[PDB]
Amino acid sequence: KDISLRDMQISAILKMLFLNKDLNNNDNITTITDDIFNQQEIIWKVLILDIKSTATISSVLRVNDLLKAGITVHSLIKQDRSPLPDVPAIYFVSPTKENIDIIVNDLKSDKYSEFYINFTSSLPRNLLEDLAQQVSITGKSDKIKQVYDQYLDFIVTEPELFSLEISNAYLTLNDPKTTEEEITGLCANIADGLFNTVLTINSIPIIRAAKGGPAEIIAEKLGTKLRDFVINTNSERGVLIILDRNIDFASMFSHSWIYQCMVFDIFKLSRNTVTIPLATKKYDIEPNDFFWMENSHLPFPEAAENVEAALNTYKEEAAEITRKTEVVKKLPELTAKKNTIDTHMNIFAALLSQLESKSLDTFFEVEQDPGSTKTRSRFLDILKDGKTNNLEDKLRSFIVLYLTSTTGLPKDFVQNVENYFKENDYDINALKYVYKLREFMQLSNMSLQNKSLYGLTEGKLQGGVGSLISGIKKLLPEKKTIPITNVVDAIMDPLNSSQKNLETTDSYLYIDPKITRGSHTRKPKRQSYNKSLVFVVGGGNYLEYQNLQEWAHSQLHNPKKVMYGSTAITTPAEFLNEISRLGASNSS
């Protein structure tokens, strides 16, 4: 019974839908039993969200969960909302002049019997006074039962994956154009996002961050924020590791065999909403998706298998019940269960379709060797069997190679391969900037030490293959740790870490908000940690998330919880743009 980051946000969100009940008193349960809900006897309320806040709720809660919490209706602050003078209202909206104004307008209008103002991040005195002044001249200040800064300004995608939804950060931060002001402002927001997360965790962590770039600024910014918070209170432990995306670009482009990553990669998977290919079917991977929370971290083959094991144990399970016996269905539990299966059932199917229709298992190998012509060839060799549904992956696997190379990479490829694109005409504005990032991928890979360790589908129920699962199962390489996992490893478990990883993270800015100045320095000290919050400033991936979890979920002798997150969870594709935009801008 261990709580995930998402469970903690869902709990905070739920506590708010209960008029921030149970607050100011006792109780340690987590997801209210119904017999207790009947203890306070709850009444229906209106729930007003705004664009940004809806994105936060719809990520962790389903409509059924809302009703179950007493929410009758939910609508955006900006819509024309029909009055409900005798019903309570809970606003969960962004701290903006715009919204505040509307709360004041609805307050006057008498749209609802009461108001429970809940701000997404934190309302500034600036606006508190504003809202106050306006409300003062109303004879209704009495109807506002409570105003709360909820500090839930982030989205929790998977159980331990979070995003500040601050898109295009790597660009904004490294674009020469960008002001020395725009940068400070950006950092300040990221610092807030983190802070918002940290408070949700209810743990004041030790901040550790790579020096020199953004990550440091943000670290020192968040250090100061957390420091005051500890002060303005009175007058093991956790760690928060803040890294620069510069630590490992190869991973932003790489290819993977684990279920999530593929789905995230090949089927733009956002907000628990897979999008399978103008043609576009949409499957919802609703949190607590019986299968998904069981085969996400699993390699395509096992997953594909485990699906047919479930569709098999479903056909059985349903046969025993077939003996006794938005639409009220005869058996919801069963229908719902089969339907989750029906989802993955063809995600795998549509996946294979995508695998073969562009022979993907190739790129994956071209990147598992970064070395001699053994691999060198296999690449031009692959771009020799020309297509089009490879074009993107081509550029990617190339970049991976150019970056992980561990040795020059002949002026030949750069020319021959570069040609293959400028002739097939697929702007390579990116390969301009990419070549620079190589010196980074090389310095941290050298500074670290990697440790290791449709009917057709209903078809593959053998425990073996379908003549395609065979190749992928054999092509299962060394799921060795990645650069990020190394840095986290050395920080969370010092005693059992390579000297290289320890020494490299040893150079990481160390800061404790509970102390004041520190000493002459904030002389880095090694400690072990149970939980950690890991934030990459400039880009997040399922690839790194996947790694970090496998690493954490394999720690026997002092288990670890790792919460990963970035300014935005960017897609190999999307990140590939950000880069090229810098190659475009970094010349004119």
């Binding site: 607050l23 003062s136 200040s141 709360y148 940290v198």
Partner: peptide
């Protein structure tokens, strides 16, 4: 932070006490 967050989160009183000062002035 440490169950001290509940403190930083609730701003009702702070608010009301402002509504109040704004009433006394206007």
């Amino acid at each position: 932070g440490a169950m001290a967050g509940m403190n930083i989160k609730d701003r009702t009183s702070e608010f009301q006490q402002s509504v109040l000062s704004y009433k006394k002035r206007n």
